[PDB]
């Protein structure tokens, strides 16, 4: 009825398996992040060996139709490899993995391994993933080649099958760190053939399985690093077919770009005559143009006129609001000619993740990005990149439109030099001022993070970095610190800005470290008031 995580904290392998088969896969989930007393008990090397041997003989008895118990057993096992990797108190002995390989082999060798079906796919998913969690990528290239070859439109009807068989591409990815795999991958001509045919199947384009077509292309592009291996011609031949059959922009461009991403990195674009595809891609994808003013230009994939106007008018509103809140006098920092901004807006986060990478050379694991360029360079035009979203602000519906735009303003009027210039951490200020100016006092998550019991001090906020991308610490606590300082110490803010507007990062760090000593009392009190009313 309910998950009893304590039942897994035992020395009895029998009782551990009773907990797995009774509590089911949804409760085994808790073992991934359980207290290390739970993990150390539940993932002893004996436990893994005994659970593996019972899993193996149970899987020999499998008769199709899915299996809640095998689903939970392979989940438990791969949860162990997760626990071994992240918990230092857990090391598996030499004889654990060959038992796990025996359990996995029993499912692979069973007559029902290539069955179609939702329930069967749910257990198959755990098996495919365990092949990866457990460092066995070198042992099952034959299964990858088989799934690529058998996959058809009937298997594709089932979410869980798509989800399970998509795992073989993660197996090819993870084998990079497996020496038996790298010592072996170079002779797998059957696999390369199958990756090619799978990717090149046009019926996948605009289907629910187009992402699998794209993952096949991406992992084939990885194989182009093995420049002298026996597969090199068929990898190359197959990548050239992908590049020739699908467009760089349009229906199926996910497959073209998947291959281009990895083949460009691990090889050379000139091997495939795709060098410099990024320019034509930029024109095709951001094919609209809309001039707000002589200082702001939008390039967009697909916006209505009503959106363009709303975005232009919203940026003009935020501009004058920025300059009075920051007391700039409309005077830029020295050596900054960034008078003109270019705004680049894709139709969705999906498109952004496909196109902004190759076009602007950024990482897209985020909600937008600002690129200052070199402000001292005459003619430099900075860019920010964003995407439309239904949760974005009307009437423009561009996610983070005002956030990224405050980055442009902040970089030109508060922060001397280009983006890398500072020699001290400014993450809290850049993201804080961008959140505070665009949202003012409307930030329910920043309020939320005060009430949940976990808070940060001023000292801790100021030393925040982008490492790990702690969105809560970066943007919400960046927001609170900037807001607090503006409400209760706008004099002090101008002194800090006097340093950053001139690039005195040592004096700036000196200023804010003072704040973190004195005002910690004020701040702690001031944030509790926000949690009150």
């Amino acid at each position: 009825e309910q998950c009893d995580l304590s039942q897994f904290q035992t020395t009895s392998s029998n009782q551990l398996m009773a907990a797995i088969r009774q509590q089911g896969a949804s409760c085994v989930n808790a073992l991934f992040s359980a207290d290390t007393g739970v993990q150390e008990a539940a993932f002893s090397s004996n436990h893994m060996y005994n659970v593996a041997q019972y899993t193996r003989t149970l899987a020999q008895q499998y008769a199709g139709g899915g299996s809640d118990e095998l689903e939970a057993l392979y989940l438990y096992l791969r949860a162990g490899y997760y626990a071994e990797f992240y918990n230092s108190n857990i090391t598996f002995l030499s004889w654990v993995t060959p038992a796990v390989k025996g359990a996995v082999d029993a499912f692979v060798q069973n007559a029902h391994f290539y069955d179609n079906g939702d329930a069967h796919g749910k257990v198959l998913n755990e098996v495919i993933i365990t092949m990866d969690s457990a460092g066995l990528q070198h042992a099952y290239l034959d299964v990858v080649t088989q799934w690529l070859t058998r996959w058809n439109a009937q298997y594709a009807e089932h979410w869980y099958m798509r989800n399970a068989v998509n795992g073989v591409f993660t197996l090819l990815f993870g084998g990079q760190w497996n020496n038996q795999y790298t010592s072996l991958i170079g002779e797998q001509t059957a696999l390369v053939t199958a990756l090619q045919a799978f990717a090149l199947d046009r019926t996948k384009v605009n289907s629910p399985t187009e992402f699998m077509a794209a993952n096949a292309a991406r992992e084939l592009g990885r194989l182009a690093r093995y420049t002298d291996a026996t597969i090199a011609p068929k990898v190359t031949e197959g990548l050239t077919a992908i590049f020739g059959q699908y467009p760089s922009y349009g229906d199926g461009d996910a497959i073209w770009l998947g291959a281009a991403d990895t083949a460009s990195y691990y090889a050379d674009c000139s091997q495939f005559n795709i060098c410099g595809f990024e320019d034509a891609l930029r024109d095709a994808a951001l094919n609209q143009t809309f001039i707000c003013s002589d200082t702001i230009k939008i390039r967009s994939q697909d916006m209505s006129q009503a959106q363009h106007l709303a975005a232009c008018d919203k940026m003009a509103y935020e501009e004058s609001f920025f300059h009075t809140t920051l007391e700039t006098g409309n005077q830029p920092v020295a050596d900054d000619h960034n008078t003109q901004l270019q705004v680049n807006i894709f139709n969705s986060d999906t498109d952004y993740g496909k196109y902004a990478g190759p076009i602007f050379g950024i990482d897209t694991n985020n909600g937008g990005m600002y690129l200052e360029g070199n402000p001292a360079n005459v003619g430099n035009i900075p860019n920010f990149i964003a995407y439309e979203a239904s949760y974005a602000n009307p009437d423009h519906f561009v996610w983070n439109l005002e956030h990224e735009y405050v980055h442009y303003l902040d970089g030109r009027f508060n922060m001397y030099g280009d983006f890398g210039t500072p020699t001290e951490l400014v993450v809290w200020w850049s993201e804080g001022v961008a959140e505070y100016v665009s949202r003012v006092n409307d930030n329910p998550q920043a309020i939320a993070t005060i009430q949940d019991g976990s808070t940060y001090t001023l000292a801790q906020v100021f030393d925040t970095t982008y490492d790990g991308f702690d969105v809560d610490r970066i943007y919400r606590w960046g927001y609170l610190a900037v807001r607090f300082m503006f409400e209760r110490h706008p004099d002090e803010v101008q002194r800090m800005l006097s340093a950053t507007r001139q690039g005195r990062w040592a004096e700036y760090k000196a200023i804010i470290s003072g704040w973190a000593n004195q005002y910690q009392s004020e701040f702690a009190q001031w944030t509790e008031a926000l949690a009150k009313g």
Binding site: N29, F32, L75, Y82, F85, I129, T170
Partner: peptide
């Protein structure tokens, strides 16, 4: 590292 939970 190893794949997280589903």
């Amino acid at each position: 590292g190893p794949p997280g939970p589903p």
